Amino acid sequence: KPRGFARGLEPERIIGATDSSGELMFLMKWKNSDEADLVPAKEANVKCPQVVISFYEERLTWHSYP
Amino acid sequence: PRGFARGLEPERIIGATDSSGELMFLMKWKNSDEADLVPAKEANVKCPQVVISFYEERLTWHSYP
């Protein structure tokens, strides 16, 4: 049954995101495991802020206007 | 003194640019109206939740096809 941070494993990277559930969820890969689980952004933001920031930094797309 | 050297508390990021060759954020500081650029590398460390709030508000999804 245990999934997400409840597995007690360390975050490796975030590989996807969805807000279909009505809240933002990140698909998280874990160190020393081939499993990935959805975790609440609310939880990821504080438990691994730098992992969250790296997910976003890699996905920037730019536009401009005067 | 500019950016974090001004010794103010970050309030929110109001924009960004990569033109310097490195990512930088335009930072609004608490009780001030003069915002200035700070490097993303410094902001990520010194105020990660403020950075995250900025990105989260701009996250969307594109489709294929």
């Binding site: 969805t18 730019w62 536009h63 | 924009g15 990569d18 701009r58 996250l59 969307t60 489709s63 096809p65």
Partner: peptide
């Protein structure tokens, strides 16, 4: 139409 969505972060490029 079968579709697949991917996350993007949209940023306005500022000056300076």
């Amino acid at each position: 139409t079968n579709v697949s969505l991917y996350p993007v972060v949209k940023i306005r490029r500022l000056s300076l």
